[PDB]
Design a protein around this ligand. Sequence first.
Ligand SMILES: OC[C@H]1CNC[C@@H](O)[C@@H]1O
Length: 444
Amino acid sequence: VKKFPEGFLWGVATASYQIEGSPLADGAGMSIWHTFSHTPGNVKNGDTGDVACDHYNRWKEDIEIIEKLGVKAYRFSISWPRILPEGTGRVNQKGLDFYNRIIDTLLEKGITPFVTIYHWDLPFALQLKGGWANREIADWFAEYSRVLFENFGDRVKNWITLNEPWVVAIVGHLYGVHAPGMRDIYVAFRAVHNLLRAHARAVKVFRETVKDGKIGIVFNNGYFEPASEKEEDIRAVRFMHQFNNYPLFLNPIYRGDYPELVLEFAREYLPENYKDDMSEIQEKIDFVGLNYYSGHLVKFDPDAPAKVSFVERDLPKTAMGWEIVPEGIYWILKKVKEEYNPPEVYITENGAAFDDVVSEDGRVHDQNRIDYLKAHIGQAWKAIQEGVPLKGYFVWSLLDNFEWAEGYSKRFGIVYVDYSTQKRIVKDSGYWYSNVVKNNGLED
Ligand SMILES: OC[C@H]1CNC[C@@H](O)[C@@H]1O
């Protein structure tokens, strides 16, 4: 038996562009993911979010699935361009109506909404003005967040400014693999910095408009282990954790500067008086969300940009090719308490992509995902037993969905989606998870 604390929040998680479809319905502006995915060569098989899970129409039935499974919390995101089609100024009532219906439905059914304000679908109109590269985004984001607080803050009380700002900056602006598809290290570190300033401005306005709410921010994290016991490899691990995990943002938020190895690597790329912004960046937050999926063996490498290479290990992997290292989720939970001691933590995403097939029996026997969830939920329980203030756990994802540059080819859902009909098939992992929420923990 591994029983969780009373009132622990068991959730599922999605993101607007990944499930909704109908990106231009009802006066919505284009996002950068619309223009990106519509550019030939950017996404596997030419996939886009034009249709996705058609959640824009099937939202009621999807929530009914959440209800039926008994899960207590739904993490979802809001499409900025549905609300403010030009990014600032005009507010689209029909966009607000879409999310209002979802919000009211969840509450009526006793599910707690956790709203991610920004999960990567910037209004295209703002990208034309530089997007995350432009310092003024801290004002645009504040205006947007304010609108969400004023319209939804009466009912939604749990808020997340940004999903995975490292990915937004580095994958979007350095690697060019995600929208807006840029490859410029100077832009990428300006985007890191503006992400922090916009997050801090949003939190500030939240204090003014939602008196009884809680607000946090979500980071991606990997469990990095050194290839050798040599000095340089252990250091390569120390760089990667500081750059790729929560310290890149939490060192600023809690200590008022970037982490030390990040400055060794990137001080030429950061804005010249970046320190002037640090005091405002330290705006107090209520919780930290950590996402976790995978671990990576890393070693020093003199030929690699950043002086780090990944080394492949003979370990069980998901369809992403990601190494399954359950103890990473425990390590990261431990480490976040050790380093910054946030008053609350949530696992805001954890999950796995496997090649799911509908059997002849009409069921999806994803024993491989059950095994994955069970192992990590076990490690999260362990972290709680050693004092980490973990208040919730969210499976990525409710639904198989548009997996960014991988398109529909990667399935993360505990519910299978047959894209040809839009049929939902609860997976074995979904029934299994439904049982652990009912029991408030593991059993065998
Ligand atoms: O890569 C799987 C998931 C990682 N975290 C952010 C999500 O949008 C993504 O689908």
